[PDB]
């Protein structure tokens, strides 16, 4: 797709937006590619996850949802509209975008259009409100009511498809084609008015059900099963782990770059035991005031070395001026970048990139000259 490495390397506008956003990488590209003549594909071959993150920060979109249910007024009543809510209205409701295309750039402005829509009966129908006749509505949006019913019919036509026999309720009512019992009463039937025509709440039920079905089918894009469904997994055997087991052998090799017998072991042991038996003067550990000086000198020299090393160990302050320090730091940075690219092409072992390896070597030699 668009997330492949070759797509990320050739996306110039993404790099444009990244350098407009980033500052330190902008300076690295300024003092590395623009001045020293490094190829830009070489610069972006090492920064593929950063380009991917910058692209995916804006490429992803939120899930579809009932945006008009979230719309609610708060005499003066105010409703706050964000651009994401407008886009969700356009995607979730094609009738509003259809009115927007031929209404806003032609006759009246966008806030006027949204206030007309919010004052119209089409908003009430799309939100699921049962349509009332005493409300005035908005006539401009009310011209789109018939085309909204046309969209409803087209969506109901395209959404229809043969379901499996597991959930075939249309089958269930047609199991007996000539079943004819006593008719269901008004409780089992949709509500009707005093004349006999419907009250219109089945219309709002169909509208919200169609909205839910649209939300589910909106997930179907580029972005035997009955045997598995009727199988009872609980009665089947539990899952057995097929994890790998290793046996480790400690028969390594010794590190490579006097044999004495048990008799003198026994005599040395006897010497230690009777030297323990007779007497240990604990004052014999005191040095003869001569080896103490030498060992003290050794200890003090070790202390001096360790203290000199550990005296100095956010970057530390430097004696260089900030202009010279910044120049040295950026020269170190382009040294590191050129060495990075040279070692990447050098260790990637292709004879086809030998010319690039030679160019990186020449750039490194010129950077040695710059140092």
């Amino acid at each position: 797709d668009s997330l492949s490495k070759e797509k990320l390397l050739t996306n110039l506008k993404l790099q444009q937006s990244l350098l407009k956003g980033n500052k330190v990488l902008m300076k690295v590209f300024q003092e590395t590619v623009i001045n020293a003549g490094l190829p830009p594909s070489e610069f972006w071959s090492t920064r593929i996850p950063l380009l991917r993150a910058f692209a995916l920060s804006t490429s992803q979109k939120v899930g579809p949802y009932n945006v008009l249910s979230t719309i609610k007024p708060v005499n003066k009543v105010n409703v706050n509209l964000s651009r994401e809510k407008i886009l969700n209205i356009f995607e979730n409701y094609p009738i509003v975008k259809k009115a927007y295309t031929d209404n806003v750039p032609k006759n009246f402005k966008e806030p006027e259009f949204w206030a007309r829509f919010f004052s119209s009966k089409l908003f009430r129908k799309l939100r699921g409100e049962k349509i009332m006749q005493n409300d005035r509505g908005d006539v401009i949006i009310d011209r789109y009511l018939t085309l909204d019913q046309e969209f409803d019919r087209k969506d109901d036509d395209m959404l229809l498809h043969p379901v499996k026999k597991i959930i075939d309720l249309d089958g269930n009512i047609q199991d007996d084609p000539v079943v004819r019992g006593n008719r269901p009463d008004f409780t089992m039937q949709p509500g009707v008015d005093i004349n006999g025509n419907s009250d219109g709440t089945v219309d709002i039920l169909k509208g919200m059900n169609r909205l839910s079905e649209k939300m589910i089918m909106a997930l179907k894009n580029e972005y035997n099963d009955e045997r598995n469904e009727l199988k009872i997994d609980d009665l089947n055997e539990s899952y057995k782990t097929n994890y790998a087991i290793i046996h480790l052998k400690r028969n390594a090799h010794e590190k490579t770059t006097l044999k004495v017998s048990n008799q003198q072991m026994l005599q040395q042991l006897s010497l230690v035991m009777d030297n323990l038996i007779n007497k240990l003067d604990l004052n014999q550990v005191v040095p003869n005031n001569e080896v103490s000086n030498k060992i003290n000198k050794r200890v003090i020299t070790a202390i001096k070395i360790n203290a000199k090393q550990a005296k100095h160990n956010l970057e530390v302050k430097s004696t260089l001026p900030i202009d010279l320090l910044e120049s040295c730091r950026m020269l170190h940075t382009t040294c590191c970048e050129f060495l990075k690219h040279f070692y990447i092409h050098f260790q990637s072992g292709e004879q086809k990139q030998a010319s690039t390896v030679k160019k990186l070597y020449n750039h490194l030699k010129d950077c040695i000259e710059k140092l």
């Binding site: 407009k20 902008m26 623009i34």
Partner: peptide, 21 residues
């Protein structure tokens, strides 16, 4: 100021587009 930096960057990218085309 980074205004001259992005102006020279846009000029460089325009020259690169002219060379590539």
């Amino acid at each position: 100021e980074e205004r001259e930096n992005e102006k020279t960057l846009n000029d460089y990218y325009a020259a690169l587009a002219k060379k590539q085309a």
